Design a protein around this ligand. Sequence first.
Ligand code: 3PE
Ligand code: 3PE
Ligand code: 3PE
Ligand code: 3PE
Ligand code: 3PE
Ligand code: LFA
Ligand code: LFA
Lengths: 100, 55, 478, 504
Amino acid sequence: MIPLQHGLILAAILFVLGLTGLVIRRNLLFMLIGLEIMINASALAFVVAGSYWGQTDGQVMYILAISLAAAEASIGLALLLQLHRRRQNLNIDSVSEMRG
Amino acid sequence: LLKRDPLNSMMNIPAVLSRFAGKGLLLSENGYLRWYVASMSIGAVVVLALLMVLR
Amino acid sequence: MTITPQNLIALLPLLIVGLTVVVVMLSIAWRRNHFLNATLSVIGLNAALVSLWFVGQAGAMDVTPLMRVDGFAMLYTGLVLLASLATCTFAYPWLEGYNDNKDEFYLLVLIAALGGILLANANHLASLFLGIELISLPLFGLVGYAFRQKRSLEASIKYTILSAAASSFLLFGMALVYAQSGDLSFVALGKNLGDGMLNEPLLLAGFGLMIVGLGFKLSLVPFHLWTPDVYQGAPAPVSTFLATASKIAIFGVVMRLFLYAPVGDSEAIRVVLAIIAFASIIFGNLMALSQTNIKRLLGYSSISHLGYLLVALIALQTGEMSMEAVGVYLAGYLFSSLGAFGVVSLMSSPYRGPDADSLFSYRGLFWHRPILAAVMTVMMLSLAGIPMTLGFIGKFYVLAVGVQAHLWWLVGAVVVGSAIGLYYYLRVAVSLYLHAPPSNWQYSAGGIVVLISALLVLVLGVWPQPLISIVRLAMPLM
Amino acid sequence: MLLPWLILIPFIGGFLCWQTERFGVKVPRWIALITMGLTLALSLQLWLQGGYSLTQSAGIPQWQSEFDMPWIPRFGISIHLAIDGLSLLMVVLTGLLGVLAVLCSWKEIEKYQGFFHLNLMWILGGVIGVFLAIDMFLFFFFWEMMLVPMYFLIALWGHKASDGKTRITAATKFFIYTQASGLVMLIAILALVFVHYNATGVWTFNYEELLNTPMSSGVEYLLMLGFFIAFAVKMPVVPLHGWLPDAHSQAPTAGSVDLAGILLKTAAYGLLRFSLPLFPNASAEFAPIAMWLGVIGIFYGAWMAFAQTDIKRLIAYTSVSHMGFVLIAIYTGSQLAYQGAVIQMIAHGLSAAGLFILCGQLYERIHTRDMRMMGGLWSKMKWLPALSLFFAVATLGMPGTGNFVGEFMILFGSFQVVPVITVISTFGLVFASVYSLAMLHRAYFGKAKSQIASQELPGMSLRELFMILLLVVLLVLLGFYPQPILDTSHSAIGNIQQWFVNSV
Ligand SMILES: CCCCCCCCCCCCCCCCCC(=O)OC[C@H](COP(=O)(O)OCCN)OC(=O)CCCCCCCCCCCCCCCCC
Ligand SMILES: CCCCCCCCCCCCCCCCCC(=O)OC[C@H](COP(=O)(O)OCCN)OC(=O)CCCCCCCCCCCCCCCCC
Ligand SMILES: CCCCCCCCCCCCCCCCCC(=O)OC[C@H](COP(=O)(O)OCCN)OC(=O)CCCCCCCCCCCCCCCCC
Ligand SMILES: CCCCCCCCCCCCCCCCCC(=O)OC[C@H](COP(=O)(O)OCCN)OC(=O)CCCCCCCCCCCCCCCCC
Ligand SMILES: CCCCCCCCCCCCCCCCCC(=O)OC[C@H](COP(=O)(O)OCCN)OC(=O)CCCCCCCCCCCCCCCCC
Ligand SMILES: CCCCCCCCCCCCCCCCCCCC
Ligand SMILES: CCCCCCCCCCCCCCCCCCCC
């Protein structure tokens, strides 16, 4: 007796919060954090949809989503460590040399 | 009065407009990643608002 | 649904590419050998390409609740495999100058090709999502393969962050679509709606968010701003793969999704896609007017050509030759981009360190590299859609499909964008012949690949009937 | 039968010109000469064996020869060639101008002369294919195909005294104009084919099958507008004209490129062959706009030609004014005006070829084209100012030259149809006399206005004089005896006119 709309609304709120954190933060680490919030919110939306329909497909899509989240976190933190090694800062606005 | 071929310049007007529009559109390619994310979210808002308007 | 031996025969290029991934991985674990591992990768890709024949005589079937193998999937599998083989061929002379490990490049190329094959066969939201990320993450590695170079690290970071954001958008849209529909197969997206109630708001919102993710993946306006930076910063064989295989595979799965989904017949989705295609054509052509960099120019070119492809996609539910137009256009665009990016890769190879710039300087190329200059001017005329080239046959198909479906705004957009493209493509082609102030068989193999692409572009430009018959032979399930 | 060889002998000859440069630097010019002589001989053989003077008008279609082969059977696209009197006259003119273009570039001993000759041969083959193709897709294919060698010739082999960037700008403007207009024509062709397919069910691009296509009024107007936009760019019709003076200015100094494709008039042929028979009602409704555009073209071209300090640009705007006359003739629906238009196209080709060859040799002698830096050149040269006087006298429409026969039959038929446009056009002939006299006064009469014009100049070569005198003889014979030309085109013109006025 939990409405499907309430779970989808919670997932949407978390998604837009993660996207806001991705946009407003100059740090690459907080950008990766916001990306993790976004993908976890989308996976929660899939879980809510699967639980409404009584199917394992929502949890299977959750499993694929968190596999993607783990591998993307790995690659993003590797690139962040490379950036910190070769520039000694995590300012994403400084990484802007290609333009026009 | 006609020695500069005014009709030729009138037909060259679209090329000038195309160059100006291309220069104006190249301002969005400033190379900033946060602006690219912001433009993605702007496009998401525009697409979703258009879909709810035309439904 | 279970898996039969006939289903295993329909699985053949996926199984062969995955086995090649495992075999190349174990060969790298045995001993680091650039030549042997590159040879094993290209042998596996060629084996998948020739196993497409056994796939064809297996017939069209449904292999999983997730995959569907038919002539459509065969054509896109062949295109993805050709792009991957060309990427490996261009990658070897570039990696000859690479100081760090070179063997992981081919592993990433093979995994991305596996993702392209999965997207070719994808009949499901799960397989579409998995194929997109299986393309994207090896491209995170490949775009930043020369991470010591500043531009490659910049392109890698931008591509990784923006592709993760688009993946989140796509998955949230898929979740909303699944909440509306209750099934993740393509044919069931909108099947629970009747009496003119196809425009359900949650289904439309979900498809809009998937449109955001896929339009990032297809460099479509307004999710296009990453394209010149990532195309410029990536290594040139990676730019070749990113221009051809990723775009072709994602457009093929988008073609199949909009063919099979009943919500693909929605008017609002059609108008939104028409707006995106119009803006993509005009913006991509306008933004390449004043580019002195060949890689950024080719990125804006990719935006325009994907706009033309989207115009062909919009008329899918109305016309009958829309997917045949898409196949012909994608074959021509693949060969033209292979030639152009391969000439760029051959002139950028070997990799001359991270502290030395990889600037092209195409001016006066004919006076030291005449064959490469001829190939590149053939590709510039092909990308402009000039007759006697296959790009014109693709543009003709797009225009015929647009005229059939009375999409007059998109037709005018194609004409205007073609004129603007004519300007900058001819500028590059004539700059090749002005005046400005290798030695191994793998470089010669890359030159052979770009020369064969130029010959194919010319021959199918004057005689396109074999390609048309092949594309019409690749009929998906109705 | 011989029509595919009429197209293919230029292409094979151009390939042989490119390939046989290894045997010598003076070899490809002989190959190009043999190629265009063979093409001209085949065209004259078709003229002799066709029996065009005895052919009566039997209605469209009526082809004296026809060739068919499947090219793209999925769309119903064929390599489909057909020749009748008007097409034969245009093909003979193309072959003669190709021979003149080969002979005009005889002394160029450049390291890449073979590619120059290949581009020239491919332009000539494309023009012949435009005149021969009666398949809509093949016609469009040749129409756009002959623009790439012209682009590369203008951009790379062009006027060497000017900067490179001016040559690339002129070539780019010409290519963009012609190819964008061609794309609009392609849209019109595609929509006509789709209307015919929805009314019949048959995939065809054959112009014979598309003649009987039921269209609504307004759809036919738009298809006619697309066709007319392409033809008006390449006629030229004002204001889609400036590419022509910019392309003539930056063409190579010999003038072979001027004779090859910039001067042959495929657009008036396309208007007569395709625009009027496919869309007769739309053309009849468009006729006032088209003849007023022709009037504006006549007077604008005359005023522009008077205002030029460049002699080449003067000749280009002269061509603009003459094409305004022909455009008026096409939309009258008169047999006399159509025959005058045919004579006027042939006479303009001959006279503009003579003017451009003489301008190229004048630039060879004096190394400038500004008329303010020359003057009094009658006393300095042996042959050139007198022949330039003859050709300028021809282009103002002197009787005894074919230009008079053309423009006066045009004006007779037009006055039979529309008198006001005719009287305004005859005052355009007064304007033509004004600009021709102005060019003659500024170039060859008076005193020398610089140092290079005050010195004696070397005489013309025997080959150059031979082909200029050949053009002089042909223009005089067209002026005094135009009846073979009128009899050759009589049946095709009659078919087009009867189709135009019997369906309106
Ligand atoms: C278990 C299930 C089935 C699995 C798949 C089938 C078995 C796979 C076996 C893979 C074996 C990998 C190791 C091969 C070692 C070859 C050693 C050799 O001869 O090396 C010579 C050369 C080395 O490189 P180079 O620098 O030229 O050396 C100069 C010094 N002589 O190297 C060369 O010149 C290149 C020699 C290439 C030899 C192998 C060619 C065939 C490879 C077949 C497998 C590829 C993937 C197949 C995918 C499925 C197809 C259905
Ligand atoms: C009868 C009217 C209605 C039907 C029209 C049908 C279309 C065909 C006939 C009209 C064609 C008009 C073309 C006008 C532009 C010609 C191209 C040109 O001028 O290119 C040269 C110019 C570069 O030279 P420059 O000025 O030196 O540049 C300095 C920059 N560093 O290049 C540039 O500056 C950039 C050029 C960009 C591309 C050209 C402009 C395209 C505009 C749309 C084309 C399609 C037509 C749509 C209708 C337009 C209005 C009539
Ligand atoms: C930027 C340069 C290019 C210009 C922009 C691109 C082209 C724009 C073309 C706009 C066309 C607007 C048509 C508006 C009416 C559509 C609805 C309609 O009336 O449909 C009627 C008919 C369908 O009904 P049906 O039973 O087939 O009747 C047969 C009628 N013959 O419909 C049909 O049969 C099909 C009608 C097709 C009409 C011709 C379309 C192309 C014409 C050539 C190009 C446009 C005109 C020239 C260029 C303009 C200036 C640039
Ligand atoms: C980057 C910016 C710059 C570059 C881009 C610039 C703009 C490019 C696009 C310009 C063209 C826009 C579209 C023009 C075509 C519009 C067609 C139209 O409105 O059609 C409506 C109607 C359709 O016919 P309908 O009445 O439905 O027929 C069935 C029953 N009779 O039509 C009719 O009934 C007949 C209508 C005829 C008049 C409309 C067409 C005008 C064409 C103007 C150009 C040509 C002018 C004439 C020739 C000049 C010299 C070449
Ligand atoms: C009279 C009642 C009945 C009406 C009949 C029609 C009008 C009759 C007019 C007769 C008089 C015309 C006189 C023309 C003189 C031309 C010669 C001349 O003066 O030449 C000087 C100048 C030389 O130019 P240039 O070659 O550059 O020389 C270098 C330096 N001098 O050359 C120039 O500057 C060029 C001069 C060009 C003159 C053009 C004249 C056009 C006449 C059009 C008549 C239209 C009639 C209808 C008008 C509208 C009615 C509603
Ligand atoms: C329209 C389809 C393609 C047509 C052919 C395009 C060109 C292909 C390459 C052919 C060889 C080019 C040689 C150019 C030599 C230029 C020499 C200039 C000297 C000033
Ligand atoms: C397409 C090229 C046209 C060139 C101009 C031709 C002009 C016509 C010349 C015809 C021959 C005139 C002189 C001979 C008259 C012979 C009379 C024969 C009947 C008795």
